[PDB]
Structure formats: C-alpha cells, structure tokens
Ligand binder design. Structure first.
Ligand SMILES: FC(F)O[C@@H](Cl)C(F)(F)F
Length: 180
C-alpha cells in the first residue's frame, strides 16, 4: 500500500549544529533506504514558524534526498510543536501538493525538547504519528510523557526516546519493517 510520510523536524536554538546535521542525515538515510517503494515524502522544519522544505510533488520530481534538503537553513528560534503538527495536517497533506488520496498518512516528528506553544492537534488525528525525542531534555519520565499527546497510541509503539543523536541509526531496521 501507498504511504505518504512527512518528516517534521525541530530547528530550534536548543539544537547544536552537529545535532541538526544528524537529523538531516537521518531523514536522507530513511529516504534512500525507501527509494523506489510505495513511499513518497515531504519535510517541514519547525521552530517559531513553519517551513515546507519540500512537498510530495518535489519528491516525485527529484527523488534525490541530497538535492531536496540542500537549501535547508537551521532556523535557530523556538519549539512551537503544536502548531507545527497542525501545519502538516492542513498545509502539507494536500492533493494539490502531491498527496495521494489512497495513501496512509504518516508523520515522523523529531525534537530535542518540550513544546513552547500549546493548544491541540485535533486537525492531525487521522495521521499516524511517531515522535522521536532525543537527548538530555528527556532524561526524566515526566519529560518523556509530555511527548505522548503528540503521538498515536500506544505510546510504547509511537514515542521513541533516544539518549543521543547517534542512536537515530538504530531506528532504520524498525522503520523499514513497518506495514501500515
Ligand atoms: F515507523 C516509521 F515511521 O519510523 C518510526 Cl519506527 C520512527 F519512530 F522512526 F519514526
């Protein structure tokens, strides 16, 4: 079956340059490992504001992850996660931007800290949502649990807590094996 997958990636000032680069490299690696499959991809950077770095139609045009993310600049502002998820739901999953009506909608949210905004993500309820929380801001159970509201249920499936950015590589086998 077809899968339309969006990477929603944190560009806040909490991320160090090498950490941000590791997020980019992970997205590229995931795409390369799923090239010429039923997958199509889009990517959105979020910080204070939201930017579609490439749409599904861009992916279909280029099919080159290096090219698609070549123009990304680290935003270096806040962490407005609620609005970011709603932005994906309303502004990226659109047929006119290459989204396929028959596809399963999937979000991979990648962040290094707690949201600086609030509200709800009701608009994104029909999207299958994974969240990857990385690094020392998620050392405590309480901090980890703040991510549950953004992800699908059960949290034990959809919330991934990684202690280091180097651990992103450990997700590839699992991601490749998913059958939606
Ligand atoms: F299932 C895919 F969406 O990848 C999952 Cl395991 C994710 F956690 F890496 F995002």
């Amino acid at each position: 079956g077809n899968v339309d997958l969006v990477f929603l990636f944190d560009g806040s000032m909490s991320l160090q340059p090498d950490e941000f680069q590791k997020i980019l490299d992970f997205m590229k690696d995931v795409m390369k490992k799923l090239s010429n499959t039923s997958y199509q991809f889009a990517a959105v950077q979020f910080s204070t504001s939201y930017k579609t770095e490439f749409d599904f139609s861009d992916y279909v045009k280029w099919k080159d992850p290096d090219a698609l993310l070549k123009h990304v600049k680290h935003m270096l502002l806040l962490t407005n996660t609620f609005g970011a998820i709603n932005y994906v739901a309303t502004e990226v999953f659109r047929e006119e931007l290459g989204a396929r009506p028959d596809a399963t909608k999937v979000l991979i949210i990648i962040t290094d800290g707690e949201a600086t905004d609030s509200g709800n993500i009701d608009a994104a309820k029909d999207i299958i949502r994974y969240i990857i929380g990385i690094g020392k801001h998620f050392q405590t159970k309480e901090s980890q649990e703040t991510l549950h509201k953004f992800a699908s249920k059960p949290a034990s499936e959809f919330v991934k807590i990684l202690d280091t950015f180097e651990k992103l590589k450990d997700l590839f086998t699992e991601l490749q094996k998913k059958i939606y």
